[PDB]
Amino acid sequence: GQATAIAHPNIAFIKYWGKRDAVLRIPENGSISMNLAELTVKTTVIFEKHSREDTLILNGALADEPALKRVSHFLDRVREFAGISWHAHVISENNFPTGAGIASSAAAFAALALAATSAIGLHLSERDLSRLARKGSGSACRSIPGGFVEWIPGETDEDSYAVSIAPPEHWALTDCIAILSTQHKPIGSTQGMALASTSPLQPARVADTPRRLEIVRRAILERDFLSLAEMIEHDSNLMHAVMMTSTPPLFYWEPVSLVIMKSVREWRESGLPCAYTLDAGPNVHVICPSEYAEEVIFRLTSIPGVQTVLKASAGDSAKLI
Amino acid sequence: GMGQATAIAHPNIAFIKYWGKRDAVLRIPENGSISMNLAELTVKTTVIFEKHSREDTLILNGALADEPALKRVSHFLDRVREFAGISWHAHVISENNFPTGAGIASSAAAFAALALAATSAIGLHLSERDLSRLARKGSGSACRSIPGGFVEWIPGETDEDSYAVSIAPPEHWALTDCIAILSTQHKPIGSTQGMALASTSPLQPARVADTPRRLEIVRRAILERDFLSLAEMIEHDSNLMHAVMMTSTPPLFYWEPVSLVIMKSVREWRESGLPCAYTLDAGPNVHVICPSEYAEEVIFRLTSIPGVQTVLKASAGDSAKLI
Ligand SMILES: C[C@@](O)(CCOP(=O)(O)OP(=O)(O)O)CC(=O)O
Ligand SMILES: C[C@@](O)(CCOP(=O)(O)OP(=O)(O)O)CC(=O)O
């Protein structure tokens, strides 16, 4: 059996940081994100005759050990579930600008979940596909549904999954991603959030998340940009507050990251609707209503140290092709 | 000419930070703090109670003080008036040897010196603990510049419970503060207004409740001259304060880009074997603490970082003194 699927990465408005269960990737708190339409990972899976091990090809080129074992552990779960035991070849390609530092694990494992299961015979619901991708990478469960998506955190494998809050056409928002010229290789999200419990501030951050989800959920449903802008910056800062107060500390910000954050707030306060948010790295995602995207990109491009700015709109669910 | 006295005090650098007031008027803090006085920086204040003054007068480095500064100093002198049962107004002449435009806070040294000089002029004889409580009411961190050396501010929940004591004299540990002054066209939000927002941060209660653990480690590290324990805690404590600042509503981003450069460098330097650690107050300047034998190397490395205007060098100073 063989199948091919595509999926988009997503930008979290309310962040996932810290696991309640390491192996199942049940998060400590819920999260909300938006799919990025112009960024895509395409993956084909082919289970085979008498193959005794899986093999992974990422962008025409062969994959390294860690990436393979990740993908093979994930395919093990798809085997137990389908009652089959064939191994497979996995061919994935992404249109991500090279050296941008756009994390791919969410899109990667959302496309794998959809391609692997469908190639092996199953027809999982969106909700069960979300639960499946979650076990590859937490944030992958949010790229299974389309548009603006909420991860319901839960306390069990059955209870932790994502659902669409609103389709992409509900709100014309754009994510302008400032790629930072100078950036090295920061500690990975998995390793980084495993340290969250060393932070004196993580329990309070986690306890407070329902307040933040409720504000962002309503802001998306009501198309209330100011309420969203202030909360996504607040929420980004709460995550980075925990990172910077972990032991050892995780300082994902670059100096230019600081300039952009301060500028974005200044732009909004002087009449340009926009807001920043950052993941586990120095690039800055600037969310704005799309009418303002070209003004936001202009100002961003003018900031010394900004290598380039990518433009992205709200994307759809993962899909078989 | 009813009485006259002159006192000097030093500013201090907090290893465990004061951020957030429990009581705005009394300046009782939400949490305790530990600081080291800085020997090479001084505020000298003379107070002269006059029979013919109907209002106070404040001269700073030979120039009449701005209106807000006189208000601060005049309200504080009202406290002194009340605690002495005397109504004289005063001429307050003050001078300091700070580098001009460097952004180094002088409020702790200012009100420490004023507390000592004003009470001495008006004829009182206050114990160090009571002087500490008085200076606290001008500026919280001023209560830590009354005792000498390394100083702990016991936070308390009442006016009488909130005071500072010296936990070790300056000569107990040769530590140097290499202060990196950062070029900047930005006027930061003052510490008073900034920390009034601390209750808006979701993370402030957790920061506050964790303070005794942080103070225990720093208090003992000073006794033991345990620099690595001190280093890691003061960077963690600095980061916890700025975490609350940046998660306030509206947020307070006191760091400039070069502040981040220095913070990461200092961590690299210590990890490569040069003992030193950073801590930041409510502004972009970075205080780098090191055992004094490494000061010259730390200053050398700091001075070559683009955006560092200059580097000041300070050692542990003594208590506020009547001269
Ligand atoms: C910082 C983030 O981007 C988190 C990404 O976390 P991951 O999905 O990469 O973590 P794993 O479950 O270990 O794969 C914020 C977010 O997207 O919510
Ligand atoms: C950030 C700090 O330097 C605090 C300075 O606070 P202030 O003593 O200036 O506050 P007020 O009581 O309002 O005068 C950290 C510290 O010194 O502990």
Side-chain angles (χ1 to χ4, degrees), chain B residues 10-83:
Chain B
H10 307 294
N12 61 69
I13 180 45
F15 296 159
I16 300 299
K17 304 293 182 185
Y18 157 43
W19 194 251
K21 284 183 194 60
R22 177 184 277 268
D23 188 293
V25 182
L26 294 165
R27 326 193 92 84
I28 297 157
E30 290 196 70
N31 60 262
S33 48
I34 291 170
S35 55
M36 179 186 82
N37 285 351
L38 300 183
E40 286 72 7
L41 295 169
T42 304
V43 169
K44 186 163 87 192
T45 292
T46 298
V47 170
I48 304 164
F49 283 99
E50 299 282 347
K51 185 261 174 220
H52 292 108
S53 288
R54 207 265 197 202
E55 71 283 43
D56 298 312
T57 310
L58 179 60
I59 307 297
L60 308 176
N61 291 329
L64 193 84
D66 61 290
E67 166 52 0
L70 172 66
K71 187 210 60 73
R72 265 203 117 169
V73 160
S74 195
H75 288 356
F76 181 89
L77 286 173
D78 286 346
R79 308 289 76 77
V80 182
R81 264 148 214 149
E82 283 152 17
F83 198 36

Side-chain angles (χ1 to χ4, degrees), chain B residues 11 53 59 144 151 154 187 301:
Chain B
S53 288
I59 307 297
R144 308 187 305 240
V151 179
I154 288 153
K187 296 88 168 210
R301 294 187 188 195

Side-chain angles (χ1 to χ4, degrees), chain B residues 205-218:
Chain B
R207 175 185 161 272
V208 160
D210 182 65
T211 314
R213 173 192 64 92
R214 307 195 302 274
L215 293 157
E216 179 63 45
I217 282 145
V218 163

